[PDB]
Design an enzyme around this catalytic site. Structure first.
Site, PDB file in Angstrom:
ATOM      1  CG  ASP A 145     -18.673 -16.803  -5.323  1.00  0.00           C
ATOM      2  OD1 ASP A 145     -19.166 -16.066  -6.687  1.00  0.00           O
ATOM      3  OD2 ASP A 145     -19.440 -16.323  -4.680  1.00  0.00           O
ATOM      4  CG  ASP A 193     -20.259 -13.503  -9.685  1.00  0.00           C
ATOM      5  OD1 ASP A 193     -19.643 -14.344  -8.737  1.00  0.00           O
ATOM      6  OD2 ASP A 193     -20.947 -12.848  -9.294  1.00  0.00           O
TER       7      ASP A 193
END
Ligand SMILES: CCCN(CCC)C(=O)c1cc(C)cc(C(=O)N[C@@H](Cc2cc(F)cc(F)c2)[C@H](O)[C@@H]2NCN(Cc3ccccc3)C2=O)c1
Length: 390
Positions: free
Chosen positions: A232, A36
């Protein structure tokens, strides 16, 4: 490719996330960890959960160190609560190094873990400024660099299959590569183009122009970065600021007007299906995002195809139709360049030079007529004004 040991070390898919295998504790406890770039905490399930078939057992680690501190992380999507500590961490298919890192042992969670994702934790690769409880909790990659000789840089090749992967298929399929400390040239074609990391918290960038099939969306560029634009991997969709979303959907509908799609489709809620192999890729427009370049008044563009923004999903009837969900949605927190966008490119997080590089991915899905692209340079004026200031 000079980092063969890390090539193909990822598994997963855009809808459930891409994960890398890691070990925590002594003796090593193997866990699958969500990659992430949109958060900064290393956190792992540390207690029984309906969706976990394994978790970190602190009492079995001789190297476990309790920090005697609680931790809370409220993501846009879900939340978890845990207990802070440190322990020895390694990446089996990564640099041959072991590091002592902060670990949030998850004891309570809500809408965090995904049934069937096959991952038991999350690796927040962003900067300490957004780490919980506060910026004093050193992120894993910072520890990695400070404790070893590993270059302050990582690169991601997320590979969408272009078709649905069932439960057995997604476990045996190679989902991509996370190259720790370097750039592997076999993962991309053409040239790498760099955009400045605007500020070191999220991997923040600045979009200076948007095109749908070459047609300028023509909005004040500051709208494209309201209140920020981030890269992201922990988010599936390309998420756009409300006003930009509305304008982009209007333009994408206009370009694809030869076919009418239900409002549910455009809301990213319902799937659309076509007889096997007949998906009309050509009626859908390519989307170009212009990013500030490293040279004054110079930009470059990344171009994605509907093979990236239409996410493959299994038909509720499991039939032979090829079905997809619209993977562009609205945001109230700025632009989020999620996994479906990253699947078209090899993305270089050059922390050392505070820049993010983009190159056409060797694994992006396309057709015989169109390909994703990374092109430059383009004369662009006043790009600093496209950045948003509170
Ligand atoms: C990736 C799998 C599918 N998925 C999550 C499950 C629907 C998404 O696509 C998706 C959709 C939306 C609206 C938000 C997020 C979603 O928050 N994703 C987060 C990770 C994540 C992944 C996951 F599978 C489950 C989670 F509960 C959290 C990201 O870190 C996100 N990036 C910026 N940010 C702000 C932030 C950063 C640091 C601290 C606090 C807040 C985020 O929360 C993910």
């Amino acid at each position: 490719g000079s980092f063969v040991e890390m090539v193909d070390n990822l598994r997963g898919k855009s809808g459930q996330g891409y994960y890398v295998e890691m070990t925590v504790g002594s003796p090593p406890q193997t866990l699958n960890i969500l990659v992430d770039t949109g958060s900064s905490n290393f956190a792992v399930g540390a207690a029984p959960h309906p969706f976990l078939h394994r978790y970190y057992q602190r009492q079995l680690s001789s190297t476990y160190r309790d920090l005697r501190k609680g931790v809370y992380v409220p993501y846009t999507q879900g939340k978890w609560e845990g207990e802070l500590g440190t322990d020895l961490v390694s990446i089996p298919h990564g640099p041959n190094v072991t590091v002592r890192a902060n670990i949030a042992a998850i004891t309570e969670s809500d809408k965090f873990f995904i049934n069937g994702s096959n991952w038991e934790g999350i690796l927040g690769l962003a900067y300490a400024e957004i780490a919980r409880p506060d910026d004093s909790l050193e992120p894993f990659f910072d520890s990695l660099v400070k404790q070893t000789h590993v270059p302050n840089l990582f690169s991601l090749q997320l590979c969408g299959a272009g078709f649905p992967l069932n439960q057995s298929e997604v476990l045996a399929s190679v989902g991509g590569s996370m190259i720790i400390g370097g750039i592997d040239h076999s993962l991309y074609t053409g040239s790498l183009w760099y955009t400045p990391i605007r500020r070191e918290w999220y991997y923040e960038v600045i979009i200076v122009r948007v095109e749908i099939n070459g047609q300028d969306l023509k909005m004040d560029c500051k709208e494209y970065n309201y209140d920020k634009s981030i890269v992201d991997s922990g988010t599936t969709n390309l998420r756009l600021p409300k006003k930009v979303f509305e304008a982009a959907v209007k333009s994408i509908k206009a370009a694809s007007s030869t076919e009418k799609f239900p409002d549910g489709f455009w809301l990213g809620e319902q799937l659309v299906c076509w007889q096997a192999g007949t998906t009309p890729w050509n009626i859908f427009p390519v989307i170009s995002l212009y990013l500030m370049g490293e040279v004054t008044n110079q930009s470059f563009r990344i171009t994605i195809l509907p093979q990236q923004y239409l996410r493959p999903v299994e038909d509720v009837a499991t039939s032979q139709d090829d079905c997809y969900k619209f993977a562009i949605s609205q945001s109230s927190t700025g632009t989020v360049m999620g996994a479906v966008i990253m699947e078209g490119f090899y993305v270089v997080f050059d922390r050392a030079r505070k820049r993010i590089g983009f190159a056409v991915s060797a694994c992006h899905v396309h057709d015989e007529f169109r390909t994703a692209a990374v092109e430059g340079p383009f004369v662009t004026l006043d790009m600093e004004d496209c950045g948003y200031n509170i």
